Ligand binder design. Structure first.
Ligand SMILES: *[C@@H]1O[C@H](CO)[C@@H](O[C@@H]2O[C@H](CO)[C@@H](O[C@@H]3O[C@H](CO[C@H]4O[C@H](CO)[C@@H](O)[C@H](O)[C@@H]4O)[C@@H](O)[C@H](O[C@H]4O[C@H](CO)[C@@H](O)[C@H](O)[C@@H]4O[C@H]4O[C@H](CO)[C@@H](O)[C@H](O)[C@@H]4O[C@H]4O[C@H](CO)[C@@H](O)[C@H](O)[C@@H]4O)[C@@H]3O)[C@H](O)[C@H]2NC(C)=O)[C@H](O)[C@H]1NC(C)=O
Ligand SMILES: *[C@@H]1O[C@H](CO)[C@@H](O[C@@H]2O[C@H](CO)[C@@H](O[C@@H]3O[C@H](CO)[C@@H](O)[C@H](O[C@H]4O[C@H](CO)[C@@H](O)[C@H](O)[C@@H]4O[C@H]4O[C@H](CO)[C@@H](O)[C@H](O)[C@@H]4O)[C@@H]3O)[C@H](O)[C@H]2NC(C)=O)[C@H](O)[C@H]1NC(C)=O
Ligand SMILES: *[C@@H]1O[C@H](CO)[C@@H](O[C@@H]2O[C@H](CO)[C@@H](O[C@@H]3O[C@H](CO)[C@@H](O)[C@H](O[C@H]4O[C@H](CO)[C@@H](O)[C@H](O)[C@@H]4O)[C@@H]3O)[C@H](O)[C@H]2NC(C)=O)[C@H](O)[C@H]1NC(C)=O
Ligand SMILES: *[C@@H]1O[C@H](CO)[C@@H](O[C@@H]2O[C@H](CO)[C@@H](O[C@@H]3O[C@H](CO)[C@@H](O)[C@H](O[C@H]4O[C@H](CO)[C@@H](O)[C@H](O)[C@@H]4O)[C@@H]3O)[C@H](O)[C@H]2NC(C)=O)[C@H](O)[C@H]1NC(C)=O
Ligand SMILES: *[C@@H]1O[C@H](CO)[C@@H](O[C@@H]2O[C@H](CO)[C@@H](O)[C@H](O)[C@H]2NC(C)=O)[C@H](O)[C@H]1NC(C)=O
Ligand SMILES: *[C@@H]1O[C@H](CO)[C@@H](O[C@@H]2O[C@H](CO)[C@@H](O)[C@H](O)[C@H]2NC(C)=O)[C@H](O)[C@H]1NC(C)=O
Ligand SMILES: *[C@@H]1O[C@H](CO)[C@@H](O[C@@H]2O[C@H](CO)[C@@H](O)[C@H](O)[C@H]2NC(C)=O)[C@H](O)[C@H]1NC(C)=O
Ligand SMILES: *[C@@H]1O[C@H](CO)[C@@H](O[C@@H]2O[C@H](CO)[C@@H](O)[C@H](O)[C@H]2NC(C)=O)[C@H](O)[C@H]1NC(C)=O
Ligand SMILES: *[C@@H]1O[C@H](CO)[C@@H](O)[C@H](O)[C@H]1NC(C)=O
Ligand SMILES: *[C@@H]1O[C@H](CO)[C@@H](O)[C@H](O)[C@H]1NC(C)=O
Ligand SMILES: *[C@@H]1O[C@H](CO)[C@@H](O)[C@H](O)[C@H]1NC(C)=O
Ligand SMILES: *[C@@H]1O[C@H](CO)[C@@H](O)[C@H](O)[C@H]1NC(C)=O
Ligand SMILES: *[C@@H]1O[C@H](CO)[C@@H](O)[C@H](O)[C@H]1NC(C)=O
Ligand SMILES: *[C@@H]1O[C@H](CO)[C@@H](O)[C@H](O)[C@H]1NC(C)=O
Ligand SMILES: *[C@@H]1O[C@H](CO)[C@@H](O)[C@H](O)[C@H]1NC(C)=O
Ligand SMILES: *[C@@H]1O[C@H](CO)[C@@H](O)[C@H](O)[C@H]1NC(C)=O
Ligand SMILES: *[C@@H]1O[C@H](CO)[C@@H](O)[C@H](O)[C@H]1NC(C)=O
Ligand SMILES: *[C@@H]1O[C@H](CO)[C@@H](O)[C@H](O)[C@H]1NC(C)=O
Lengths: 442, 122, 122, 122, 48
């Protein structure tokens, strides 16, 4: 009946905390932007420890791991651009003609002067540009030269995203929600703890999410304010749809030296046919997937309400299109074929047009732009569509109609798609509790 | 049973108190990494600092001379140790941890050593 | 005799065990330097961490409750302490140090404290 | 009275010795900051290192086996503890602190543990 | 004063060819060279 406080060191106690995480990935054989020269190798085996009886609240939208990853991708991009060749002298006036035998189709053959390696001497060379990179005043100029400076991506580096593990330091920990039907924030009954997350591929993408992790059981709808239209809508598929993306054009590259050491790689004349880049999607599987999504969608809008799908109708060219990277080239796909539907109460694979741009400012970056060097040979990448990003048209009249447009307003949403399950906490191992014990009297 | 790091986070405080070594092991073991490693040893040394001023440096558990003021919690032994988790306990005793830590260094260690000098003075 | 830091690295384990303070002193005392200093305090705190979970924080030597399993080494007192160096000993006991450390925190300290709670419970 | 961090810097050594916890609390708690934080934990761990090799890790005060050589200071108990401040004392004992620290690890701890092995050898 | 402490009876295997101090020093000289070049005058216009 006489109680005295007792110190316990190493008690299972944690608090919500934001700390600086770090990278981790298994060692491979080069030089990709994300791995850099060095990122700590992963443990051969991670120890994922289930925590019985433990219920913790998760919030994917107020999560700081997202903001950290966002700034990390941006900063990594700039760290990779510094040593490469900056194309400040490439803002010379371009004398351009259309290709010339265009039956039904844009890309333009241009000629221009260029500084050689000697300052004083000049060369007249020619290059082929996809007409998104140039604008007129036949005289032309690069799109970027009035907005920002430009630098050329080094040829060696690869833009092929590899799994990255985010780790928290000792004394902190990561909680992982394993609740299958987890609707995007809330209490997670089944929670396990790890020091590092699983391999998250930093896939740079717009509208549809590519090569990601699939939700088990039902497809999952994650938002921040479901009745609100301004906030985007995250979709995680249970079945991945397969999408085959190719640039058929036989691109040949030449190397012109523009200064001491500096060497620009330019798109030579195409050899063979002129075909436009495209992406195929099995209409059957995409119709099943679209069906299953609207089944889970109607759980939030009453039950036989009219759910239609329309195209993107807002914003710049770089945001309205499914932008991504494939083999080196940057694809801007028009996704009108998929989102042209209405829902109430042979192979036939859909085909999607894709244009190509070599000058790019991703993540709303105004400032130092990048020139994607031309890629030799025909390109073909097979990818998974594991998620989606949707947006409403506005306050709908509520049980009257529901029209959906795909968006990609912000790039963090892509990190939220794979970091929805993880949360960072700090261990407070000091607990004091009363027992009927006293220390030896002085 | 050994359930692992934080294995008994959701068990009763009495059951969890048996596996303090489990949480104790992993509790200590370029720029981002380095700053993180410094933060880790900094937090660990803070807790070891508090155990120091409470005279409990080498032990995981130690008993004190501070009595339990009933204003802190009105529960008993059985209700605390066989019905609650350390998490919800730390939440209930989140208004006093500063206060209890201050009494913990002062009431005993700030008077255990003075009496120690006056006692070993012969 | 004081032979200095690591002076008895090549003496018998018994002779070397007398000058543990010698190795203990120097064991703790821009970017390259800073990263090196952090690594140093990190390793030192790791060993002090292991001494902590073995209940031996303030001492250089402490005795244990773990019995010596003869599978580890078949030598005796005289053969170990008066014929071998700590180096070749650590090489012979390099398959068990992990195992012995696990038994060292669990067999005694993970049961010394439970019995301590059940004993000081009156 | 609690006067605060370094409150009794200008009081007598005896009065100041009562509030060692006060100086002990705040004694532990981008590039410039990080380098400063490392320097702080480095100095703190140095002093804790010295307390370690003197067998006084968990205590603020501990008594020794080293006798007071009168060549160091010719003062007495009353003159030291009731007439001088720790500052002017540390200035008077600034020629021996290295020497006294060497005797402090060797005279006792370097022989306390050898005798401990020869004593617990049965 | 450095304290070079002789270790009686101690026999250790050395390998100068598998030594990492070499690789460290190599990268240090290279990196130091570049750190010293950055602030100085770059003669890009001298290719006339
Ligand atoms: C979703 O996930 C899927 C699954 O991972 C992704 O699909 C994969 O995408 C990969 C990258 O997008 C793609 O990888 C490429 O495959 C090409 C063909 O592979 C064939 O050869 C390899 C052996 O090398 C075989 O194992 C394989 O079976 C095939 O037969 C490779 O050629 C590609 O490597 C080249 O590109 C990368 C950049 O991506 C460079 O880093 C690399 O060095 C290669 O580039 C050299 O070769 C080309 C050849 O034309 C040259 O043009 C170029 O200039 C380079 O040449 C220089 O360098 C070499 C070497 O140093 C030197 O000798 C030479 O002289 C030059 O200096 C690349 O590996 C996968 O094939 C594809 N998976 C499948 C199953 O198809 C999908 O992308 C993901 N989704 C998204 C959105 O990312
Ligand atoms: C650097 O250069 C690049 C390329 O050279 C610039 O990118 C172009 O920027 C211009 C203008 O900044 C932009 O032209 C406008 O595009 C809009 C969207 O497509 C059009 O809606 C707009 O049309 C209106 O303005 C015209 C006059 O310029 C009118 O003739 C026309 O009728 C439109 O006016 C109607 O609408 C307005 C607004 O509602 C209303 O007030 C009027 O009363 C009227 O009803 C322009 O055509 C190009 O689209 C950009 N080019 C590309 C390829 O994207 C870049 O902006 C420059 N950098 C900087 C920093 O300025
Ligand atoms: C895109 O534009 C670029 C411009 O830099 C262009 O490159 C040039 O195309 C012209 C096409 O006329 C090439 O000129 C030809 O060169 C060949 C070989 O030297 C000549 O034999 C040709 O002469 C014949 O055609 C004339 C037409 O009037 C006749 O008068 C004459 O009698 C001959 O029959 C002609 O002069 C020129 O060589 C290239 N330049 C380079 C550097 O290659 C490119 O071809 C355009 N893209 C496409 C798809 O056409
Ligand atoms: C995109 O366009 C380019 C054109 O710039 C194209 O490159 C050409 O591809 C073919 C291969 O399909 C190359 O032909 C080979 O070249 C090598 C090296 O010179 C030769 O050794 C080869 O000889 C073999 O084949 C002969 C057939 O008669 C045999 O007689 C001989 O014994 C050998 O077995 C062969 O000629 C050609 O050199 C390149 N051209 C250039 C300029 O690089 C490329 O194929 C197109 N891309 C794609 C993906 O198709
Ligand atoms: C996911 O679904 C859960 C239902 O289990 C939502 O949680 C409720 O949200 C409403 C507001 O929409 C709150 O008033 C309730 O307090 C919540 N209920 C419980 C039991 O926590 C959650 O909001 C949904 N998430 C999203 C993004 O819509
Ligand atoms: C794209 O989706 C396919 C399934 O449609 C994935 O193929 C499966 O990959 C898993 C590994 O995660 C294997 O266990 C399965 O056996 C594969 N399926 C079949 C039918 O063989 C493929 O990995 C996905 N691609 C990604 C995520 O890049
Ligand atoms: C994307 O490409 C893959 C492989 O190139 C296609 O898979 C082929 O599908 C047909 C049946 O439709 C099979 O006969 C082939 O055996 C498959 N190929 C392989 C290598 O297994 C897939 O159908 C393509 N997707 C689309 C939408 O066209
Ligand atoms: C993507 O493709 C669609 C075709 O479905 C294009 O939509 C047309 O846009 C024009 C105005 O630009 C309208 O007058 C037509 O009625 C639309 N077509 C249909 C069938 O409705 C769309 O412009 C393309 N998007 C981009 C960015 O090129
Ligand atoms: C190259 O420079 C000359 C000036 O010496 C100019 O006449 C010519 O038009 C330039 N080349 C092109 C393709 O415009
Ligand atoms: C979010 O939804 C609630 C639900 O009624 C609404 O009251 C609130 O205004 C919405 N917030 C925003 C920012 O639109
Ligand atoms: C909507 O349909 C689902 C599935 O059949 C059913 O569980 C639910 O009760 C329906 N909602 C209403 C309001 O009728
Ligand atoms: C796509 O939209 C257009 C415009 O209304 C329409 O003519 C076409 O039938 C739609 N395609 C499909 C597959 O519904
Ligand atoms: C216990 O808490 C009460 C708050 O009502 C306070 O007045 C009292 O001084 C405390 N008692 C002790 C012994 O600290
Ligand atoms: C902590 O203090 C606040 C305000 O003084 C009070 O609302 C809260 O209930 C207190 N916590 C507990 C566990 O009593
Ligand atoms: C000693 O080692 C043997 C290996 O043969 C093992 O089977 C046994 O359990 C160990 N004994 C103890 C008491 O740990
Ligand atoms: C350590 O284990 C390996 C393989 O199990 C064995 O070859 C080696 O001899 C062992 N070490 C000792 C000292 O027995
Ligand atoms: C005390 O100091 C004197 C200096 O005159 C020295 O000779 C003597 O050895 C010291 N005594 C002890 C016991 O250390
Ligand atoms: C310390 O030594 C120097 C020179 O040996 C001497 O001048 C000084 O007085 C000494 N300090 C004390 C307190 O005696």
């Amino acid at each position: 009946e006489n109680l005295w406080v007792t110190v316990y060191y190493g008690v299972p106690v944690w608090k919500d905390a934001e700390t600086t995480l770090f990278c981790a990935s298994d060692a491979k054989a080069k030089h990709n932007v994300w791995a850099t020269h060095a990122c700590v190798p992963t443990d051969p085996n991670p120890q994922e420890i289930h925590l019985e009886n433990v219920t913790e609240e998760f919030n994917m939208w107020k999560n700081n791991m997202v903001e950290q990853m966002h700034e990390d991708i941006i900063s990594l991009w700039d760290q990779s651009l510094k040593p490469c060749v900056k194309l400040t002298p490439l803002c010379v006036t371009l004398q351009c003609t259309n290709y010339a035998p265009f039956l039904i189709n844009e890309l333009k053959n241009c000629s221009f002067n260029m500084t050689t390696e000697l300052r004083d001497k000049k060369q007249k060379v020619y290059s082929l540009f996809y007409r998104l990179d140039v604008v007129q005043i036949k005289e032309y100029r690069l799109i970027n030269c009035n907005t920002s400076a430009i630098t050329q991506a080094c040829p060696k580096v690869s833009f092929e995203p590899i799994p990255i593990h985010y780790c928290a330091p000792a004394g902190f920990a990561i909680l992982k929600c394993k609740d299958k039907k987890f609707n995007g924030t809330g209490p997670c009954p089944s929670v396990s703890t790890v020091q590092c997350t699983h391999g998250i591929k930093p896939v740079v993408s717009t509208q549809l999410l590519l090569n990601g992790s699939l939700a088990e059981e039902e497809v999952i709808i994650r938002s921040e304010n479901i009745t609100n239209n301004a906030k985007n809508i995250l979709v995680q598929l249970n079945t991945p749809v397969q999408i085959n993306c190719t640039r058929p054009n036989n691109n040949t590259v030449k190397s012109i030296r523009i200064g001491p050491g500096q060497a620009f790689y330019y798109t030579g004349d195409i050899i063979g046919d002129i075909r436009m880049a495209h992406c195929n999607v099995s209409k059957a599987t995409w119709n099943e997937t679209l069906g299953k999504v609207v089944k889970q969608l109607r759980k939030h809008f009453g039950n036989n309400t009219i759910i239609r799908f329309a195209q993107s109708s807002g914003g710049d060219l770089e945001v309205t299109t499914h932008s991504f990277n494939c083999g080196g080239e940057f694809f801007y796909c028009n996704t009108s074929g998929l989102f042209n539907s209405t829902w109430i109460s042979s192979n036939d694979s859909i085909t999607l047009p894709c244009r190509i741009k070599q000058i790019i400012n991703m993540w709303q970056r105004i400032g130092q732009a990048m020139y994607a060097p031309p890629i030799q040979g025909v390109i073909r990448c097979v990818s998974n569509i594991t998620g989606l990003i949707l947006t409403r048209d506005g306050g709908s009249t509520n049980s009257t109609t529901e029209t959906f447009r795909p968006g990609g307003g912000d790039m963090r949403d892509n990190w939220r798609s794979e970091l929805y399950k993880y949360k960072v906490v700090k261990i407070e191992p000091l607990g004091v509790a009363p027992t009927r014990c006293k220390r030896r009297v002085v | 049973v050994s359930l692992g790091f934080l294995g008994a986070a959701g068990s009763t405080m009495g059951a969890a108190s048996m596996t303090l070594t489990v949480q104790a092991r992993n509790l200590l073991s370029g720029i981002k990494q380095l700053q993180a490693r410094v933060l880790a040893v900094e937090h660990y040394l803070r807790d070891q600092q508090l155990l120091g001023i409470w005279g409990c440096s080498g032990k995981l558990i130690c008993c004190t001379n501070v009595p339990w003021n009933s204003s802190w919690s009105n529960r008993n032994l059985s209700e605390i140790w066989d019905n609650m988790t350390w998490l919800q306990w730390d939440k209930e005793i989140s208004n006093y941890t500063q206060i209890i830590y201050g009494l913990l260094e002062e009431s005993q260690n700030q008077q255990e050593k003075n009496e120690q000098d006056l006692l070993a003075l012969d």
